[PDB]
Each structure stands twice: as structure tokens, then as C-alpha cells.
Design a binder for this molecule. Structure first.
Ligand SMILES: C=C1[C@@H](O)[C@@H]2O[C@]3(CC[C@H](/C=C/[C@@H](C)[C@@H]4CC(C)=C[C@@]5(O[C@H](C[C@@](C)(O)C(=O)O)CC[C@H]5O)O4)O3)CC[C@H]2O[C@@H]1[C@@H](O)C[C@H](C)[C@@H]1CCC[C@@]2(OCCC[C@@H]2C)O1
Ligand SMILES: [Mn+2]
Ligand SMILES: [Mn+2]
Lengths: 581, 288
């Protein structure tokens, strides 16, 4: 090997002419050392063949070559970059072949129209009509860039190869061609889209291999846009209606997945004619994967029907189908619908929503699958901005309150976790009036786990509404429990102060919580006393050092002289941790 | 040694057994502590009274979920920590480990099963064998059970014991009199306290258990009155509802092993006695 190129080589390992990784990225510089002429005559050739399987490298080399146009002599010599890229296109680990293509596409534009014909298309062909298969898979992404700029004669040629690529004997080479069929169709003259693209399309849509067919749905969207509204029923719709009916649920899945897109590509009239029935069939598919994919589209689809027929097809065609799904077996499906159903409110009006959706809203808010009612609870924002907050509270509050005081705790615990959500959605004024009661009521529940749950719930609430709202609305009632005769409740008070110091800030903690904590240092029950040491060890860090020395250090030292073994041990511990010992 | 007890407890909460090594250690220290305790252990409220557990470890964990974690919540168990359940070793050790780390926060009584002959028929003996390869952990534990207090008096008004009353014990002093440092006898006061059951037939009767007696309301009332007790608190018996009142509320049964033997389908309960000896019940099902 020889300098300056030798610099790229990694003379230290034990490879097969491997290159220094941290060097292939510093390539635009070795190209600067030797000149443009030598970058071509010696740097490029060396890169061309020297192709070991060091992937992290091949990648960089493919990427790097896409910006080497100018370090080779500018456009007139842009083609010197083809040889090494052609190589890299036929490699293995797809990641590399992708790069090689992205770059080939990049520099295609640098190529002049004439150099496109003289060196590019030839590369496209040899790649397309190559033996090996990857050489073909990658060959499919190079047709749309060179088509427009070359001659009518070469265009023709390009179209033929793209076909041969579609009708390839290999499923993979066909899937590839199919998922690039749309892109290619977009750069052809209308006639040829009709006479050449349509047949290629039809063929792929009726492929023996469903893996290929489901990929023609995406093509349909693209082809369907380029064609004028009238031509659709003749050259496309039969095919698309057949896909929605395909034997392979995978193909049907793809139709339900790209529904909203087909709906635009095709236009309102056909959507009302051909798509509304298909949509109805999809929601009733036997395979739950499809019903769910479709259910997911509900809100978006109705949102897109033409303004005039909208409200009618919905209450007549779509809505009955939805009532059906709210009762579906697979939670996969109930789940999908639930995440978007209440998004229909705006599109139906305060009157319709309140009469036809609020019922479904409830049927789901009381579903087993907790995910389901959680999806309903996560999207109240729109239902609320459509009907009155009093109208919603009139249909939600009872579902809540009925569960917040139910049989088994667990079901009750579940309702405590909807609170920070209801808060951040329904707003602070609603929460202070109709929800703050249920959250304080839980702080004194019979089950420990419920009190624990509702305690950390305050922290989540103060994060939603702030330290001001906390001192005015929550601290007052939490501190009230220190007077309670039950020790389970007095300790609950200290527990709320530990969690609340985390987010109430130094001022509020020192002014309005520390006093209540220090005051209980003399509680009649031992458990409260030692938990006071713990609470001081907890909130001590938030208090400025002056307070820590004047008011905390004292009380702790006292507690260390307490009769009870545990108050003593915990009083000590508290001191040793705060450094006041 | 205190940082160590904490570890053993953290471990035991993950249902992970301690080593023969440490169980031997934990058991001797537990002996020192349990020796100084009375046959009628004084327990001041507030404190939660628990009944049978029987190695149902995950239910014991569900118990702490409902009544609070130790040592923030004070507890009193009335025995029967082993047998029947699948985790007698983890259960009894967590509890004994809790007693040594927190003498004033927990009180453990002796049930009819904290004995040597019955544990070789109902589980505990064999389970130790499947988990330690020899019978040592069983000796350390059955030896320790000899030191467990036969009964506890909460606030001088609420008398707690595992089984029930005896025809050869009329006063709390009669009990303090007995020598409890021994295996449980086949007859007598110590035996009856651990085996008897309240009944709905008057006076004394023949216990279907084969040990101890049955005692009607009249007997309890006399026993309560003579000892200035407002209530007799015991376990030992399966109660579907988790807890049960009987004898014109002179007696209350508390069962804390929900769905006993994993076949009964019963609820479990624990009794909360607040700062004012006011009682409240917590019923619960087996943890999922
Ligand atoms: C255990 C028991 C009694 O307590 C049990 O008392 C009866 C009445 C109520 C009880 C059943 C209660 C049900 C709720 C459970 C529910 C389930 C699903 C199972 C089951 O479980 C029982 C055992 C046990 C644990 O789970 C229990 O006491 O509940 C055994 C019967 C079985 O059906 O009943 O049965 C009659 C049969 C008795 O047998 C044995 C008894 O021979 C033991 C024997 C009397 C002991 C054995 C150890 C040695 C010694 O120590 C006492 C002094 C003399 C001697 C030293 O002698
Ligand atoms: Mn018993
Ligand atoms: Mn029992």
C-alpha cells in the first residue's frame, strides 16, 4: 500500500485489507490531498473493489460517495462515482444497499441528461437485468429519477424493464417493484399511466403471492390520484373493491390501513358510492386484526366524507356499525375503537353526541379491559368542548363516583389513577368543585393501599395545578387529619407531607407543613412519633440550613431521649443523615 | 446487626427463604426476646389483631396491603403460621424476623400448629426438608415455638388466644401460673387454650377436634365477667365471612387465611383496635 491512500488502511488488526472506520468518514480529505485527477485515477478505483464485509464501513462509504460529486471534478465527471456505488448496491445487509441507492438517486441529478443516457440507465439495466436478486431488488429505486430527463426512446426502454421487474419470477423482486410502482407512476405521462401502469398494477394486485398483493394497495392510492375522477371506475375501482374482498386478510388489513388515503385519492362521490360499503364490510371482517384497523379509521373517515352527505351517512351507515363494535369480543378491537370514538363529537353536534354517543361513551367507560376505559378517559377533551362541561359531568361523574366507592379496592385503586388525567383535561375549576372531595375522602379509606395510592396522587395533582393551588386547596385539609384520634389517620398526614415536599417548594414546606410535622413530635402513640423522625429526615433537605439548625436539630435530639426503642433509633438515623448529629 | 435484620426482611418480602445459617441465628435471638414475655402478654392499643395465616405467604402480603406495613402499623397474630399453605417456611420466618427487628410493633402468639407433632403431619416438616435438605431449620423453629406466649391481654380488656377457653382455667392468674416452655400437651389448660372452640350448646361439650373442649355462651360470659374483659378474641376456626361474632358478642373469631387450603373459598379478616380500643373489621379475598 502507498501514501496518501495507505492512510485509509488499518495496518494494525488481522483483516483482509480492512479500512480504519474513523477514517472512511474523514475521506473527503484524502481526496483533497491527491488532486481531482488522482481522486479519480487512484482513490476511486481503490474504493471500488476493496470491499470487505466490515459493514459499519460499507455504510459510510456508500453515504460518503453521495457527496463526492465535486471532489471528482464536478458534474462532467460525476459518473466516476457509479462503479463503486453499483458495487455497494449488490451487497448484503440491506442497510448498505439502501444507502447505495439513496446516493445513486442523489447524484443522478448531477448527471447531465446526456450522461444519464450514456452511463446511468445502463447501470439501471445491468442492475435490473442482473443475475443475482439483490442486484434487482435495489434496481427498482432508480427508475423514477432518470425517467423524466431522458429521451422518449429511452423512456420506452425504461418502462419495459420496470415491467419485467414486476413480472419477475421472484416474490421479492416483485414486492420491491410493487412498492416503487407508485413513485414511478408519478413521473410518467398520463397516457402511459393508463396504458402501461394500469396493467402492471392489475397484474400485481392479482398476484399468486399475497405478500405482493398487500403491497398493491399502497400503489392503488398513488395510481388513483394521478387519474381523473371518471377513469377511476373503469381502470381502478374494480381492482380496489376486489382487494377489500381479498382472500388474504393481510390484503384486507392493508385496505383498512390505507383507507383514509384511498378516500382522498379516489374522491367524495366514489367514497359515498364504493367506499362506505367496503368500510362497513371491513368493520365486520371475521379476523379481529382487520376490524380493529378499520375501527381505528372511524373518526378520520367520517371527518372526510363530503360536507353535504356527511351527517346522514354517519347516523345511517357508520353509527349502527359502531354500536356493534363497542360489544365486540376481541379487546384488540374494543381497544382500537375506544381510542378514537369520542373524536366524533364535533362532527355530530352537541345534540347528536349527547343522544347517540354518550351512551357508547358509558358502555366503554365500564368495560373490563382497563385499557379500554383508559382510552375513553384519555380523550375527553373534545367531547367536552362540544357538549357542555355540565352536560359531560352529568354523564361522567356518576360513572366515576360509582366506582370510587365500590366493592373491592383495586377497582377503587384503578379510579385513583384516572384522577391526574381527569384533572389535566377537564380543568382546575372543575376539579376543585366536583373532584377534590373524592381525593380527600380516599386519604382516609379503610384499605391501606388505597390511602397510599391517594397520597402519592396529590403529588401528581400538584404537578398538574401548581404549588399555589396546593397551599390553598390541599394542604389545609391534609393538615386537618393531625387532629384525628386514629393513629392510622395521623400518620397518613405525615405521609402526605413527605410526598408534597417533593413538589411544593422550600417556602410552602417551611411555612405551612414543617410546623405541623414538628408539632406531632409529641404524639401519644409511638408509631406517629418515630414516623415524625422519618418525615424530618425526608423533608429536611428541602429546608434551608438555618431552619434545619434552629428548629429541626432540637426536636430530633429530644426524640432520641424518647422511651420507645424505635422512635429513638429513627431519631438518631434522621440526625446522622441530615448531618445535624 | 440491625442493618442485617433489615436485609433478611427485604429478602423475605421477595418470598426468598433465609439460609439454615441465619435461621439458626434469628431463632436464638427470638428466643431471648420471647422469654421475657408473659403467658398473658400485655399489649397496648392501637394494634391490629390477626388470626390464622398457615403459610399462605402471598395472602400475608395481601394482609399488609390492607392494614399497613410493619412497623408503621402495630400487629398481633394469634398463631397458626405453618402447615396447609405452600410457604410455611417463608411465612413464619418473615413474621419471626419482624418480631426480632420490632419487639414493640409485633406480637406473635402460639397456635395449635406451632408444635412438633402436628407439623410432621400437615406440611411444615416436609417443606423444610425440600428447602434445606436436612431437618435443622425445623428444630430451630419448633424449639422457638415453645417460647411463644400462650395469650395476650390488650389494654386489660380484650383477651386474645388462638383456640379458646378451658374447664381448668378460670382466671388470668391461672394462666400466668402455667409453665408454657414445653411442647404442647395432649390434655390440660395449655392444650385447651390452643384447641377449644366456642359453641352454640350450653356449658362444656365434646370437641369434634379430638382435643380441647367446646364452650357455650354462659361459660364465656362468666369468664369475661370474672376477668373484667369486654371481649374474647380468638382464631383457630374457619369462618367463611372472614370473621364472626358469637355468644352475644363475648367472643369473636378472626381467620386471616383467605380461601383456606386453596379450596375453601372463604374470606379472611383482621380486626383493627384503634387508640380508643374501638374495633373495626377488614374483610379481604386472596391476593391475585
Ligand atoms: C388437626 C385436627 C383437628 O383440627 C380436626 O378438627 C376437625 C373438626 C374441624 C376440623 C376441620 C376444619 C376444616 C376447616 C378443615 C377444612 C379442610 C380443607 C380440611 C380439613 O383440615 C383439617 C386439618 C386442619 C389443620 O386443616 C384444620 O384443623 O382445619 C383436617 C380435616 C380436613 O377436612 O378440615 O376437623 C375434626 C378432625 C380433626 O383432625 C385433626 C386432629 O385429629 C388432630 C389431632 C387431634 C392432634 C394431631 C397432633 C397431635 C395431637 O395434638 C393434640 C393433642 C393430642 C395429640 C398430641 O392430636
Ligand atoms: Mn388452629
Ligand atoms: Mn388453623
Amino acid at each position: 500500500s502507498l501514501y496518501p491512500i495507505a492512510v485509509l488502511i488499518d495496518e494494525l488488526r488481522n483483516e483482509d485489507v480492512q479500512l480504519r472506520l474513523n477514517s472512511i468518514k474523514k475521506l473527503s480529505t484524502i481526496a483533497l490531498a491527491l488532486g481531482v485527477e488522482r481522486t479519480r485515477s487512484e482513490l476511486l478505483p481503490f474504493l471500488t473493489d476493496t470491499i470487505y464485509d466490515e459493514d459499519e464501513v460499507l455504510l459510510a462509504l456508500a453515504e460518503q460517495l453521495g457527496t463526492f460529486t465535486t471532489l471528482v471534478g464536478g458534474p462532467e465527471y460525476v459518473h466516476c462515482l457509479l462503479p463503486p456505488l453499483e458495487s455497494l448496491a449488490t451487497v448484503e445487509e440491506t442497510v448498505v444497499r439502501d444507502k447505495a441507492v439513496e446516493s445513486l438517486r442523489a447524484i443522478s441529478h448531477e448527471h447531465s441528461p446526456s450522461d444519464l443516457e450514456a452511463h446511468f440507465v445502463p447501470l439501471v439495466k445491468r442492475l435490473a437485468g442482473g443475475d443475482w436478486f439483490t442486484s434487482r431488488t435495489s434496481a427498482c429505486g432508480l427508475f423514477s429519477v432518470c425517467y423524466p430527463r431522458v429521451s422518449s426512446a429511452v423512456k420506452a426502454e425504461l418502462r419495459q424493464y420496470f415491467r419485467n421487474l414486476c413480472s419477475d419470477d421472484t416474490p421479492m423482486v416483485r414486492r420491491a417493484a410493487a412498492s416503487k410502482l407508485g413513485e414511478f407512476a408519478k413521473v410518467l405521462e398520463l397516457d402511459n399511466v393508463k396504458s402501461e401502469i394500469i396493467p402492471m398494477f392489475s397484474n400485481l394486485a392479482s398476484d399468486e403471492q399475497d405478500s405482493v398483493r398487500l403491497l398493491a394497495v399502497e400503489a392503488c392510492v398513488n395510481i388513483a390520484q394521478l387519474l381523473p375522477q371518471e377513469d377511476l371506475e373503469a381502470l381502478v375501482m374494480p381492482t380496489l373493491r376486489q382487494a377489500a374482498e381479498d382472500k388474504s386478510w393481510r390484503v384486507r388489513y392493508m385496505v383498512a390501513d390505507k383507507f383514509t388515503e384511498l378516500q382522498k385519492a379516489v374522491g367524495p362521490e366514489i367514497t359515498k358510492t364504493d367506499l362506505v360499503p367496503a368500510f362497513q364490510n371491513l368493520m365486520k371482517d371475521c379476523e379481529a386484526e382487520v376490524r380493529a384497523a378499520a375501527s381505528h379509521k372511524v373518526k378520520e373517515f367520517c371527518e372526510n366524507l363530503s360536507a353535504d352527505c356527511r351527517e346522514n351517512v354517519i347516523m345511517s351507515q357508520i353509527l349502527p356499525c359502531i354500536k356493534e363494535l363497542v360489544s365486540d369480543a376481541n379487546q384488540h378491537v374494543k381497544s382500537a375503537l375506544a381510542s378514537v370514538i369520542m373524536g366524533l363529537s364535533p362532527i355530530l353536534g352537541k345534540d347528536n353526541t349527547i343522544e347517540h354517543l354518550l351512551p357508547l361513551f358509558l358502555a366503554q367507560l365500564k368495560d373490563e379491559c382497563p385499557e379500554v376505559r383508559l382510552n375513553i378517559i384519555s380523550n375527553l377533551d373534545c367531547v367536552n368542548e362540544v357538549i357542555g362541561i355540565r352536560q359531560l359531568s352529568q354523564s361522567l361523574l356518576p360513572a366515576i363516583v360509582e366506582l370510587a366507592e365500590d366493592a373491592k379496592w383495586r377497582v377503587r385503586l384503578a379510579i385513583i389513577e384516572y384522577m391526574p388525567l381527569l384533572a389535566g383535561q377537564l380543568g382546575v375549576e372543575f376539579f376543585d368543585e366536583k373532584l377534590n372531595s373524592l381525593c380527600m375522602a380516599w386519604l382516609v379509606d379503610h384499605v391501606y393501599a388505597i390511602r397510599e395510592a391517594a397520597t402519592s396522587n396529590l403529588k401528581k395533582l400538584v404537578e398538574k395545578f401548581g404549588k399555589e393551588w396546593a397551599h390553598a386547596t390541599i394542604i389545609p385539609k391534609v393538615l386537618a387529619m393531625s387532629g384525628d384520634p386514629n393513629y392510622l389517620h395521623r400518620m397518613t398526614t405525615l405521609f402526605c407531607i413527605n410526598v408534597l415536599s417533593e413538589v411544593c417548594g422550600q417556602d410552602i414546606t417551611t411555612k405551612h407543613m414543617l410546623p405541623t410535622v414538628l408539632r406531632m413530635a409529641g404524639d401519644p402513640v409511638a408509631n406517629v412519633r418515630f414516623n415524625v423522625a422519618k418525615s424530618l429526615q425526608k423533608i429536611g433537605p428541602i429546608l434551608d440550613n438555618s431552619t434545619l439548625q434552629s428548629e429541626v436539630k432540637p426536636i430530633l435530639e429530644k426524640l432520641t431521649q424518647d422511651q420507645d426503642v424505635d422512635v429513638k433509633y429513627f431519631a438518631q438515623e434522621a440526625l446522622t443523615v441530615l448531618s445535624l448529629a | 446487626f440491625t442493618k442485617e435484620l433489615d436485609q433478611w426482611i427485604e429478602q423475605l418480602n421477595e418470598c426468598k427463604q433465609l439460609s439454615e445459617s441465619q435461621v439458626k441465628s434469628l431463632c436464638e435471638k427470638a428466643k431471648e426476646i420471647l422469654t421475657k414475655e408473659s403467658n398473658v402478654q400485655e399489649v397496648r392499643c392501637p394494634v391490629t389483631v390477626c388470626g390464622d395465616v398457615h403459610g399462605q405467604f402471598h395472602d400475608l402480603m395481601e394482609l399488609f396491603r390492607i392494614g399497613g406495613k410493619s412497623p408503621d402499623t402495630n400487629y398481633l397474630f394469634m398463631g397458626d403460621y405453618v402447615d396447609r399453605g405452600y410457604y410455611s417456611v417463608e411465612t413464619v420466618t418473615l413474621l419471626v424476623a419482624l418480631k426480632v427487628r420490632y419487639r414493640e410493633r409485633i406480637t406473635i402468639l402460639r397456635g395449635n400448629h406451632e408444635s412438633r407433632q402436628i407439623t410432621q403431619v400437615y406440611g411444615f416438616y416436609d417443606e423444610c426438608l425440600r428447602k434445606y435438605g436436612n431437618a435443622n431449620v425445623w428444630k430451630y423453629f419448633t424449639d422457638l415455638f415453645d417460647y411463644l406466649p400462650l395469650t395476650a391481654l390488650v389494654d386489660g380488656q380484650i383477651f386474645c388466644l388462638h383456640g379458646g377457653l378451658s374447664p381448668s382455667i378460670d382466671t388470668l392468674d391461672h394462666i400466668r401460673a402455667l409453665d408454657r416452655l414445653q411442647e404442647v400437651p395432649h390434655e390440660g389448660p395449655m392444650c385447651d387454650l390452643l384447641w377449644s372452640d366456642p359453641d352454640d350448646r350450653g356449658g362444656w361439650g365434646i370437641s369434634p377436634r379430638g382435643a380441647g373442649y367446646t364452650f357455650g355462651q354462659d361459660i364465656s360470659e362468666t369468664f369475661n365477667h370474672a376477668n373484667g374483659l369486654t371481649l374474647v378474641s380468638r382464631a383457630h376456626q374457619l369462618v367463611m365471612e372472614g370473621y364472626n361474632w358469637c355468644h352475644d358478642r363475648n367472643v369473636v373469631t378472626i381467620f386471616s387465611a383467605p380461601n383456606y387450603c386453596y379450596r375453601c373459598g372463604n374470606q379472611a379478616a383482621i380486626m383493627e383496635l384503634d387508640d380508643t380500643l374501638k374495633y373495626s373489621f377488614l374483610q379481604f379475598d386472596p391476593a391475585p
